[PDB]
Amino acid sequence: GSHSMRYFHTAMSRPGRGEPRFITVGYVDDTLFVRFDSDATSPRKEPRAPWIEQEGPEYWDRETQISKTNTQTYRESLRNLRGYYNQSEAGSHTLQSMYGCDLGPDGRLLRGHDQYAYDGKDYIALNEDLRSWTAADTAAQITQRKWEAARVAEQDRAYLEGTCVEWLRRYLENGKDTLERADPPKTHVTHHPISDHEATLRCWALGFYPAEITLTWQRDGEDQTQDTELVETRPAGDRTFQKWAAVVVPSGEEQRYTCHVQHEGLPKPLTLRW
């Protein structure tokens, strides 16, 4: 019932290879729906999900202009950052940001976000109050000062409480057949001897959406946290995700182990055995 919209910006400098590349992608939950790439033959905001395609030419023009403006702003920010850190013109640097809204099940704003990282390090972030900033260091304190004078937080708050929520709600309605459909995991357990006296039990979850899932192994009802090998949830490429969890078990003791699966798409949580 909870949903979120998030835009992700990345600018990457590349001395000797032209101006910094700028990319934006936008997501509702785990679904990419729009992209922009300054390195594109003809840079524009482009649809990446069928439900956004119905937005008109005016939408795409405005969204594209925003991205073109951002390309320029982010390049200027990278120049500023280099100076803030006394860095040479030689190296390549990354500036990232993400912003957007989380709704609770009731469909009202639950939390807003607007935050930045430089070279993979948190730099500055809008606080949950949508009125103040947390700056990581003395460089970000400079940015904080400029943003307080520019009333940036007020702009974010207004966008986050208004436009962001309204359009996310619009997107959810337009894409409800997918965005509001949870697809449960298809699950099974495999068994692979490692030696004469131990075997791997692997619990599989496939074809699920959204990405959030819990997979655990129990031995005699007790959680096997430290002894469970869990892989990162991974995209299948058809919008769905996959995950597995494995434990090494003594030969003959397999019946002591249970796999437990929980996911939004499931009527009831599952308990699996080999």
Partner: peptide
């Protein structure tokens, strides 16, 4: 829909 930001939020 993105936020209509400008150069006043350059870092």
């Amino acid at each position: 829909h993105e936020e209509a930001v400008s150069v006043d939020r350059v870092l």
